[PDB]
Protein backbone atom coordinates (compact mmCIF):
# COMPACT_ATOMS: atom_id res chain seq x y z
CA UNK A 1 0.00 0.00 0.00
CA UNK A 2 1.36 3.38 -1.13
CA UNK A 3 0.18 6.93 -0.52
CA UNK A 4 0.82 9.55 -3.16
CA UNK A 5 0.92 13.08 -1.67
CA UNK A 6 1.09 16.47 -3.30
CA UNK A 7 1.66 18.94 -0.52
CA UNK A 8 1.09 22.64 -1.16
CA UNK A 9 2.04 25.56 1.09
CA UNK A 10 0.99 29.06 0.28
CA UNK A 11 1.71 32.07 2.46
CA UNK A 12 0.05 35.43 1.95
CA UNK A 13 1.71 38.12 4.06
CA UNK A 14 -0.28 41.14 2.94
CA UNK A 15 -2.33 41.99 -0.18
CA UNK A 16 0.75 42.16 -2.43
CA UNK A 17 3.30 39.59 -1.12
CA UNK A 18 2.87 35.80 -1.41
CA UNK A 19 4.70 32.54 -2.19
CA UNK A 20 3.71 28.95 -3.05
CA UNK A 21 5.87 25.83 -2.76
CA UNK A 22 4.94 22.16 -3.33
CA UNK A 23 6.64 18.80 -2.73
CA UNK A 24 5.51 15.35 -3.87
CA UNK A 25 5.73 12.15 -1.83
CA UNK A 26 5.19 8.53 -2.80
CA UNK A 27 5.39 6.82 0.56
CA UNK A 28 8.33 8.33 2.41
CA UNK A 29 10.34 9.18 -0.79
CA UNK A 30 10.19 12.60 -2.46
CA UNK A 31 9.32 12.42 -6.16
CA UNK A 32 8.89 16.08 -7.13
CA UNK A 33 9.73 19.55 -5.92
CA UNK A 34 8.21 22.78 -7.15
CA UNK A 35 9.54 25.98 -5.64
CA UNK A 36 7.87 29.41 -6.00
CA UNK A 37 11.15 30.56 -7.58
CA UNK A 38 10.85 27.95 -10.34
CA UNK A 39 8.68 28.10 -13.50
CA UNK A 40 8.60 24.30 -13.76
CA UNK A 41 8.16 21.30 -11.45
CA UNK A 42 11.48 19.55 -10.75
CA UNK A 43 11.93 15.78 -10.71
CA UNK A 44 13.66 14.64 -7.53
CA UNK A 45 13.86 11.07 -8.88
CA UNK A 46 14.99 9.71 -12.25
CA UNK A 47 11.54 8.13 -12.66
CA UNK A 48 9.36 11.02 -11.45
CA UNK A 49 7.73 11.30 -14.90
CA UNK A 50 6.38 7.78 -14.30
CA UNK A 51 4.98 6.26 -17.49
CA UNK A 52 3.81 9.52 -19.08
CA UNK A 53 5.08 10.56 -22.52
CA UNK A 54 6.87 13.89 -22.76
CA UNK A 55 3.80 15.36 -24.49
CA UNK A 56 1.56 14.07 -21.65
CA UNK A 57 3.76 15.57 -18.95
CA UNK A 58 4.24 18.87 -20.83
CA UNK A 59 0.45 19.16 -20.85
CA UNK A 60 0.11 18.17 -17.21
CA UNK A 61 2.77 20.60 -16.01
CA UNK A 62 1.21 23.49 -17.94
CA UNK A 63 -2.11 22.76 -16.22
CA UNK A 64 -0.39 23.24 -12.85
CA UNK A 65 1.58 26.17 -14.16
CA UNK A 66 -1.77 27.84 -14.94
CA UNK A 67 -3.23 26.75 -11.59
CA UNK A 68 -0.52 28.30 -9.39
CA UNK A 69 -1.07 31.73 -10.92
CA UNK A 70 -4.82 31.32 -10.64
CA UNK A 71 -4.80 29.94 -7.13
CA UNK A 72 -2.77 32.93 -6.04
CA UNK A 73 -5.12 35.47 -7.55
CA UNK A 74 -8.19 33.58 -6.36
CA UNK A 75 -7.20 33.55 -2.71
CA UNK A 76 -6.30 37.24 -2.97
CA UNK A 77 -9.79 37.98 -4.27
CA UNK A 78 -11.56 35.62 -1.89
CA UNK A 79 -10.01 37.79 0.88
CA UNK A 80 -11.40 40.99 -0.67
CA UNK A 81 -14.76 39.22 -0.81
CA UNK A 82 -14.84 38.26 2.85
CA UNK A 83 -13.03 41.34 4.25
CA UNK A 84 -13.19 42.50 6.92
CA UNK A 85 -13.97 38.88 7.89
CA UNK A 86 -10.44 37.48 7.51
CA UNK A 87 -7.08 39.20 7.43
CA UNK A 88 -3.49 38.59 6.34
CA UNK A 89 -1.21 36.81 7.20
CA UNK A 90 -2.95 33.88 5.53
CA UNK A 91 -1.71 30.31 5.45
CA UNK A 92 -3.13 27.81 2.96
CA UNK A 93 -2.16 24.15 2.70
CA UNK A 94 -3.37 21.52 0.26
CA UNK A 95 -2.88 17.80 0.50
CA UNK A 96 -3.87 15.84 -2.59
CA UNK A 97 -3.23 12.45 -4.15
CA UNK A 98 -4.35 8.87 -3.56
CA UNK A 99 -3.83 5.75 -1.47
CA UNK A 100 -3.04 2.83 -3.84
CA UNK A 101 -4.45 -0.65 -3.11
CA UNK A 102 -3.86 -4.00 -4.92
CA UNK A 103 -5.50 -4.67 -8.29
CA UNK A 104 -7.20 -1.58 -9.69
CA UNK A 105 -8.66 0.07 -6.56
CA UNK A 106 -7.76 3.45 -4.95
CA UNK A 107 -9.22 6.48 -3.12
CA UNK A 108 -8.28 9.98 -4.21
CA UNK A 109 -8.39 12.94 -1.82
CA UNK A 110 -7.97 16.72 -1.89
CA UNK A 111 -7.95 18.37 1.52
CA UNK A 112 -7.51 22.07 2.17
CA UNK A 113 -6.31 23.71 5.34
CA UNK A 114 -6.64 27.33 6.41
CA UNK A 115 -4.52 28.81 9.21
CA UNK A 116 -3.45 25.24 10.13
CA UNK A 117 -6.99 23.82 10.36
CA UNK A 118 -8.68 21.44 7.91
CA UNK A 119 -11.69 23.22 6.43
CA UNK A 120 -12.43 22.26 2.82
CA UNK A 121 -12.28 19.20 0.59
CA UNK A 122 -13.19 18.26 -2.91
CA UNK A 123 -15.63 15.40 -2.67
CA UNK A 124 -17.63 13.90 -5.53
CA UNK A 125 -18.20 16.73 -8.00
CA UNK A 126 -17.97 19.79 -5.78
CA UNK A 127 -16.06 21.58 -3.02
CA UNK A 128 -17.56 21.21 0.46
CA UNK A 129 -16.56 22.38 3.93
CA UNK A 130 -15.80 19.78 6.59
CA UNK A 131 -17.29 19.63 10.13
CA UNK A 132 -16.15 22.45 12.43
CA UNK A 133 -15.38 24.91 9.61
CA UNK A 134 -16.63 28.47 9.92
CA UNK A 135 -19.86 29.42 8.17
CA UNK A 136 -18.27 32.34 6.35
CA UNK A 137 -16.50 29.87 4.05
CA UNK A 138 -19.89 29.09 2.48
CA UNK A 139 -19.49 32.07 0.14
CA UNK A 140 -16.00 30.99 -1.00
CA UNK A 141 -17.49 27.52 -1.60
CA UNK A 142 -20.50 28.93 -3.48
CA UNK A 143 -18.08 30.72 -5.79
CA UNK A 144 -15.66 27.86 -6.36
CA UNK A 145 -18.56 25.56 -7.19
CA UNK A 146 -19.84 28.17 -9.64
CA UNK A 147 -16.84 27.25 -11.75
CA UNK A 148 -17.90 24.21 -13.80
CA UNK A 149 -14.62 24.03 -15.79
CA UNK A 150 -12.52 23.71 -12.64
CA UNK A 151 -14.84 20.98 -11.39
CA UNK A 152 -14.50 18.84 -14.54
CA UNK A 153 -10.73 19.26 -14.42
CA UNK A 154 -10.41 18.35 -10.73
CA UNK A 155 -12.67 15.29 -11.10
CA UNK A 156 -10.43 14.11 -13.91
CA UNK A 157 -7.27 14.68 -11.78
CA UNK A 158 -8.55 12.68 -8.83
CA UNK A 159 -10.63 9.99 -10.60
CA UNK A 160 -8.39 9.23 -13.59
CA UNK A 161 -5.05 11.02 -13.69
CA UNK A 162 -3.87 10.28 -10.15
CA UNK A 163 -4.35 6.50 -10.06
CA UNK A 164 -2.96 6.07 -13.59
CA UNK A 165 0.03 8.30 -12.88
CA UNK A 166 1.01 6.46 -9.72
CA UNK A 167 0.49 2.95 -11.07
CA UNK A 168 3.00 4.19 -13.63
CA UNK A 169 5.32 5.55 -10.95
CA UNK A 170 5.36 2.30 -8.98
CA UNK A 171 6.66 0.50 -12.08
CA UNK A 172 9.38 3.01 -12.87
CA UNK A 173 10.22 3.55 -9.21
CA UNK A 174 10.21 -0.13 -8.21
CA UNK A 175 13.99 -0.13 -7.74
CA UNK A 176 14.28 2.73 -5.23
CA UNK A 177 11.01 1.83 -3.52
CA UNK A 178 12.08 -1.71 -2.71
CA UNK A 179 15.60 -0.62 -1.74
CA UNK A 180 17.30 -2.26 1.23
CA UNK A 181 19.75 -0.16 3.24
CA UNK A 182 21.42 -1.56 6.35
CA UNK A 183 21.23 0.08 9.77
CA UNK A 184 24.38 0.83 11.72
CA UNK A 185 24.17 1.06 15.52
CA UNK A 186 26.15 2.66 18.35
CA UNK A 187 25.89 3.11 22.11
CA UNK A 188 26.33 5.91 24.69
CA UNK A 189 25.05 7.04 28.12
CA UNK A 190 23.87 10.23 29.90
CA UNK A 191 22.82 10.98 33.51
CA UNK A 192 20.10 6.37 31.00
CA UNK A 193 21.84 4.27 28.32
CA UNK A 194 21.13 5.11 24.65
CA UNK A 195 21.12 2.90 21.56
CA UNK A 196 21.53 4.86 18.32
CA UNK A 197 20.27 3.19 15.11
CA UNK A 198 20.92 4.91 11.80
CA UNK A 199 20.85 4.38 8.04
CA UNK A 200 18.16 1.74 7.68
CA UNK A 201 15.54 1.55 4.93
CA UNK A 202 12.65 0.81 4.87
CA UNK A 203 11.09 2.43 7.94
CA UNK A 204 9.78 -0.75 9.67
CA UNK A 205 12.42 -1.65 12.33
CA UNK A 206 12.78 -3.27 15.79
CA UNK A 207 15.11 -2.11 18.61
CA UNK A 208 15.28 -3.43 22.18
CA UNK A 209 17.61 -3.41 25.17
CA UNK A 210 18.51 -6.96 26.22
CA UNK A 211 20.28 -8.84 28.96
CA UNK A 212 21.00 -12.22 27.34
CA UNK A 213 17.62 -13.34 25.96
CA UNK A 214 15.35 -11.13 28.10
CA UNK A 215 13.82 -7.86 26.90
CA UNK A 216 14.03 -4.74 29.07
CA UNK A 217 10.46 -3.41 29.31
CA UNK A 218 11.43 0.20 30.16
CA UNK A 219 12.97 0.67 26.69
CA UNK A 220 11.54 3.97 25.37
CA UNK A 221 11.60 4.11 21.57
CA UNK A 222 11.98 7.63 20.09
CA UNK A 223 10.43 9.01 16.89
CA UNK A 224 11.69 8.16 13.46
CA UNK A 225 14.05 10.91 12.35
CA UNK A 226 15.13 11.32 8.71
CA UNK A 227 18.64 11.44 7.31
CA UNK A 228 19.54 13.60 4.27
CA UNK A 229 20.30 10.49 2.20
CA UNK A 230 16.73 9.15 2.49
CA UNK A 231 17.38 6.57 5.18
CA UNK A 232 16.07 6.55 8.74
CA UNK A 233 17.34 7.25 12.28
CA UNK A 234 15.87 6.14 15.61
CA UNK A 235 17.11 5.75 19.19
CA UNK A 236 16.17 3.65 22.26
CA UNK A 237 16.59 4.81 25.87
CA UNK A 238 16.50 2.73 29.05
CA UNK A 239 16.92 3.99 32.62
CA UNK A 240 19.64 2.23 34.62
CA UNK A 241 20.92 2.55 38.19
CA UNK A 242 24.68 3.20 38.03
CA UNK A 243 26.79 0.02 37.99
CA UNK A 244 24.16 -2.17 36.28
CA UNK A 245 25.46 -1.53 32.73
CA UNK A 246 27.23 -4.94 32.77
CA UNK A 247 26.00 -7.75 30.49
CA UNK A 248 23.79 -5.37 28.53
CA UNK A 249 23.44 -5.19 24.75
CA UNK A 250 21.23 -3.55 22.11
CA UNK A 251 19.57 -5.91 19.60
CA UNK A 252 18.26 -4.60 16.31
CA UNK A 253 16.16 -6.52 13.79
CA UNK A 254 15.58 -5.10 10.29
CA UNK A 255 14.62 -6.44 6.86
CA UNK A 256 18.00 -5.49 5.35
CA UNK A 257 20.17 -7.81 7.40
CA UNK A 258 18.25 -11.02 6.69
CA UNK A 259 18.11 -12.41 10.23
CA UNK A 260 21.61 -11.22 11.04
CA UNK A 261 20.51 -9.17 14.07
CA UNK A 262 22.82 -6.41 15.19
CA UNK A 263 24.28 -7.32 18.56
CA UNK A 264 26.17 -4.54 20.32
CA UNK A 265 27.42 -5.32 23.81
CA UNK A 266 28.27 -2.60 26.34
Amino acid at each position, epitope marked *: NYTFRCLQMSSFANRSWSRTDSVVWLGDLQTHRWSNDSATISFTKPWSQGKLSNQQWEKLQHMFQVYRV*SFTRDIQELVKMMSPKEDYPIEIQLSAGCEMYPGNASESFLHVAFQGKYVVRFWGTSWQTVPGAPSWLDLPI*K*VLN*A*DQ*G*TSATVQMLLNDTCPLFVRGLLEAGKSDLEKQEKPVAWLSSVPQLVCHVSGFYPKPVWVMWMRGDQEQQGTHRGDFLPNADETWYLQATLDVEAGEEAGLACRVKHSSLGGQDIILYW
Partner: T-cell receptor
Amino acid sequence: AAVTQSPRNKVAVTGGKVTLSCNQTNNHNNMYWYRQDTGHGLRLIHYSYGAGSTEKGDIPDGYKASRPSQENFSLILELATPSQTSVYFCASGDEGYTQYFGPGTRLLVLE
Amino acid sequence: TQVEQSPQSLVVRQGENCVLQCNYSVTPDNHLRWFKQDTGKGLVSLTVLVDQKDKTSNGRYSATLDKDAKHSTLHITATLLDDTATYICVVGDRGSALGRLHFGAGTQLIVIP
Protein backbone atom coordinates in the same frame (compact mmCIF):
# COMPACT_ATOMS: atom_id res chain seq x y z
CA ALA B 1 -31.91 40.90 -14.81
CA ALA B 2 -31.73 44.74 -15.25
CA VAL B 3 -29.12 47.39 -14.32
CA THR B 4 -29.93 51.12 -14.13
CA GLN B 5 -27.44 53.99 -14.39
CA SER B 6 -27.96 57.65 -13.59
CA PRO B 7 -27.46 60.16 -15.03
CA ARG B 8 -27.36 59.02 -18.63
CA ASN B 9 -25.50 62.12 -19.72
CA LYS B 10 -23.49 64.76 -17.81
CA VAL B 11 -21.69 68.02 -18.62
CA ALA B 12 -19.17 68.99 -15.93
CA VAL B 13 -16.43 71.55 -15.38
CA THR B 14 -12.79 70.89 -14.38
CA GLY B 15 -12.28 70.59 -10.62
CA GLY B 16 -15.98 70.00 -9.92
CA LYS B 17 -17.49 66.95 -8.21
CA VAL B 18 -19.24 64.42 -10.42
CA THR B 19 -21.05 61.39 -9.06
CA LEU B 20 -22.15 58.65 -11.40
CA SER B 21 -24.56 56.16 -9.90
CA CYS B 22 -25.62 52.61 -10.63
CA ASN B 23 -28.54 50.62 -9.29
CA GLN B 24 -29.56 46.92 -9.41
CA THR B 25 -32.49 45.11 -7.77
CA ASN B 26 -31.20 41.63 -8.71
CA ASN B 27 -29.68 41.07 -5.27
CA HIS B 28 -26.27 40.62 -6.91
CA ASN B 29 -23.39 40.78 -4.45
CA ASN B 30 -20.88 42.04 -7.01
CA MET B 31 -20.70 45.28 -9.04
CA TYR B 32 -18.16 46.83 -11.43
CA TRP B 33 -17.40 50.23 -12.97
CA TYR B 34 -15.93 50.44 -16.47
CA ARG B 35 -15.01 53.18 -18.97
CA GLN B 36 -15.01 53.02 -22.79
CA ASP B 37 -12.74 55.23 -24.96
CA THR B 38 -12.25 54.90 -28.69
CA GLY B 39 -9.43 52.51 -29.60
CA HIS B 40 -9.43 50.81 -26.18
CA GLY B 41 -11.70 48.04 -24.98
CA LEU B 42 -13.59 48.47 -21.72
CA ARG B 43 -11.32 49.17 -18.73
CA LEU B 44 -12.16 48.31 -15.12
CA ILE B 45 -11.84 51.23 -12.62
CA HIS B 46 -13.26 50.04 -9.31
CA TYR B 47 -15.47 47.18 -8.17
CA SER B 48 -17.31 45.79 -5.15
CA TYR B 49 -18.14 42.53 -3.43
CA GLY B 50 -20.91 43.93 -1.25
CA ALA B 51 -22.16 46.76 0.90
CA GLY B 52 -19.17 48.60 2.40
CA SER B 53 -16.55 47.02 0.13
CA THR B 54 -14.84 48.99 -2.61
CA GLU B 55 -11.91 47.65 -4.61
CA LYS B 56 -9.34 49.22 -6.91
CA GLY B 57 -9.52 47.95 -10.50
CA ASP B 58 -7.01 48.50 -13.32
CA ILE B 59 -7.14 52.27 -13.71
CA PRO B 60 -8.50 53.45 -10.33
CA ASP B 61 -6.54 56.75 -10.35
CA GLY B 62 -8.80 59.81 -10.32
CA TYR B 63 -11.79 57.85 -9.04
CA LYS B 64 -13.32 56.99 -5.68
CA ALA B 65 -16.04 54.32 -5.23
CA SER B 66 -18.90 53.81 -2.80
CA ARG B 67 -21.13 50.83 -2.09
CA PRO B 68 -23.57 52.14 0.54
CA SER B 69 -26.06 49.32 -0.08
CA GLN B 70 -26.44 46.01 -1.94
CA GLU B 71 -28.44 47.93 -4.55
CA ASN B 72 -26.27 51.01 -5.20
CA PHE B 73 -22.72 51.34 -6.55
CA SER B 74 -21.44 54.91 -7.13
CA LEU B 75 -18.40 56.25 -8.98
CA ILE B 76 -17.22 59.58 -7.57
CA LEU B 77 -14.85 61.99 -9.25
CA GLU B 78 -13.73 64.48 -6.55
CA LEU B 79 -11.80 66.79 -8.92
CA ALA B 80 -12.92 66.08 -12.49
CA THR B 81 -10.44 66.50 -15.35
CA PRO B 82 -10.95 66.49 -19.16
CA SER B 83 -9.18 63.12 -19.49
CA GLN B 84 -12.22 61.73 -17.66
CA THR B 85 -14.47 62.47 -20.62
CA SER B 86 -15.73 58.97 -21.47
CA VAL B 87 -18.71 56.67 -21.64
CA TYR B 88 -18.99 54.89 -18.29
CA PHE B 89 -20.55 51.47 -17.89
CA CYS B 90 -21.72 49.81 -14.72
CA ALA B 91 -22.15 46.05 -14.29
CA SER B 92 -23.48 43.58 -11.72
CA GLY B 93 -23.26 39.81 -11.07
CA ASP B 94 -23.76 36.91 -8.66
CA GLU B 95 -21.21 34.12 -8.22
CA GLY B 96 -21.32 33.40 -11.97
CA TYR B 97 -19.16 34.72 -14.78
CA THR B 98 -21.90 36.78 -16.49
CA GLN B 99 -21.86 40.52 -15.93
CA TYR B 100 -25.05 42.36 -16.71
CA PHE B 101 -24.30 45.84 -17.97
CA GLY B 102 -26.19 49.10 -17.65
CA PRO B 103 -26.99 51.42 -20.57
CA GLY B 104 -23.85 53.51 -20.05
CA THR B 105 -23.40 57.15 -19.02
CA ARG B 106 -21.70 59.75 -21.20
CA LEU B 107 -19.67 62.39 -19.38
CA LEU B 108 -17.94 65.44 -20.82
CA VAL B 109 -15.58 67.53 -18.72
CA LEU B 110 -14.81 71.01 -20.06
CA GLU B 111 -12.22 73.62 -19.05
CA THR C 1 -3.12 44.29 -24.85
CA GLN C 2 -4.48 40.74 -24.50
CA VAL C 3 -7.49 40.71 -26.86
CA GLU C 4 -7.21 41.83 -30.50
CA GLN C 5 -9.92 42.25 -33.16
CA SER C 6 -9.72 42.28 -36.95
CA PRO C 7 -10.66 43.96 -39.24
CA GLN C 8 -10.58 47.25 -37.37
CA SER C 9 -13.55 48.34 -39.53
CA LEU C 10 -15.30 47.12 -42.71
CA VAL C 11 -17.99 48.18 -45.23
CA VAL C 12 -20.49 45.74 -46.80
CA ARG C 13 -23.55 45.80 -49.05
CA GLN C 14 -26.69 44.32 -47.50
CA GLY C 15 -27.14 40.59 -48.16
CA GLU C 16 -23.41 39.89 -48.07
CA ASN C 17 -21.80 37.87 -45.28
CA CYS C 18 -18.88 38.91 -43.18
CA VAL C 19 -16.27 37.31 -40.96
CA LEU C 20 -15.00 38.97 -37.78
CA GLN C 21 -11.94 37.76 -35.88
CA CYS C 22 -10.86 37.66 -32.25
CA ASN C 23 -7.31 36.71 -31.30
CA TYR C 24 -6.30 36.69 -27.66
CA SER C 25 -3.43 35.88 -25.28
CA VAL C 26 -5.54 35.65 -22.06
CA THR C 27 -4.78 32.88 -19.52
CA PRO C 28 -6.67 30.94 -18.55
CA ASP C 29 -9.45 31.38 -21.10
CA ASN C 30 -12.73 30.14 -19.66
CA HIS C 31 -15.20 31.61 -22.13
CA LEU C 32 -15.48 34.10 -24.99
CA ARG C 33 -18.39 36.44 -25.55
CA TRP C 34 -19.32 38.51 -28.60
CA PHE C 35 -21.34 41.68 -28.10
CA LYS C 36 -23.14 43.98 -30.52
CA GLN C 37 -23.06 47.73 -29.68
CA ASP C 38 -25.07 50.32 -31.63
CA THR C 39 -23.55 53.78 -31.70
CA GLY C 40 -24.01 55.54 -28.36
CA LYS C 41 -25.71 52.53 -26.84
CA GLY C 42 -25.26 49.43 -24.78
CA LEU C 43 -23.77 46.00 -24.90
CA VAL C 44 -26.18 43.40 -26.29
CA SER C 45 -24.78 39.85 -25.93
CA LEU C 46 -24.92 37.79 -29.12
CA THR C 47 -23.41 34.50 -28.00
CA VAL C 48 -20.97 32.94 -25.57
CA LEU C 49 -18.58 30.10 -26.44
CA VAL C 50 -17.31 27.83 -23.65
CA ASP C 51 -15.66 24.61 -24.89
CA GLN C 52 -12.15 23.84 -26.21
CA LYS C 53 -13.45 23.75 -29.78
CA ASP C 54 -16.89 25.31 -29.70
CA LYS C 55 -19.52 26.42 -32.22
CA THR C 56 -22.64 28.49 -31.52
CA SER C 57 -25.40 30.19 -33.50
CA ASN C 58 -28.12 32.78 -32.96
CA GLY C 59 -30.34 33.67 -35.91
CA ARG C 60 -28.00 35.15 -38.50
CA TYR C 61 -24.93 35.16 -36.25
CA SER C 62 -22.85 32.03 -35.95
CA ALA C 63 -19.52 31.78 -34.14
CA THR C 64 -16.62 29.43 -33.44
CA LEU C 65 -13.93 29.24 -30.75
CA ASP C 66 -10.63 27.32 -30.77
CA LYS C 67 -8.84 27.50 -27.42
CA ASP C 68 -5.54 26.03 -28.68
CA ALA C 69 -5.25 28.66 -31.39
CA LYS C 70 -6.73 31.11 -28.88
CA HIS C 71 -8.94 32.42 -31.66
CA SER C 72 -12.63 33.13 -32.41
CA THR C 73 -14.53 34.10 -35.56
CA LEU C 74 -18.03 35.52 -35.78
CA HIS C 75 -19.93 35.03 -39.05
CA ILE C 76 -22.87 37.26 -39.86
CA THR C 77 -25.00 35.80 -42.69
CA ALA C 78 -27.06 37.94 -45.07
CA THR C 79 -26.39 41.33 -43.53
CA LEU C 80 -29.18 43.80 -42.80
CA LEU C 81 -28.83 47.57 -42.39
CA ASP C 82 -29.49 47.11 -38.62
CA ASP C 83 -26.16 45.23 -38.26
CA THR C 84 -24.39 48.57 -38.59
CA ALA C 85 -22.72 48.56 -35.20
CA THR C 86 -19.45 47.94 -33.37
CA TYR C 87 -18.83 44.27 -32.55
CA ILE C 88 -16.93 43.60 -29.34
CA CYS C 89 -14.95 40.61 -28.13
CA VAL C 90 -14.55 39.62 -24.45
CA VAL C 91 -12.59 36.81 -22.75
CA GLY C 92 -13.22 35.50 -19.22
CA ASP C 93 -10.43 34.51 -16.79
CA ARG C 94 -12.66 32.22 -14.73
CA GLY C 95 -15.96 30.37 -14.81
CA SER C 96 -17.00 32.42 -11.75
CA ALA C 97 -17.28 35.92 -10.21
CA LEU C 98 -13.53 35.71 -9.44
CA GLY C 99 -12.72 36.37 -13.11
CA ARG C 100 -11.79 39.55 -14.93
CA LEU C 101 -13.18 40.34 -18.39
CA HIS C 102 -10.70 41.26 -21.14
CA PHE C 103 -12.14 43.50 -23.86
CA GLY C 104 -11.33 43.96 -27.53
CA ALA C 105 -11.51 47.45 -29.00
CA GLY C 106 -14.18 46.23 -31.41
CA THR C 107 -14.70 45.94 -35.15
CA GLN C 108 -16.88 48.66 -36.68
CA LEU C 109 -19.39 47.39 -39.27
CA ILE C 110 -21.19 49.52 -41.88
CA VAL C 111 -23.84 47.81 -44.01
CA ILE C 112 -24.91 49.78 -47.12
CA PRO C 113 -28.67 49.26 -47.66
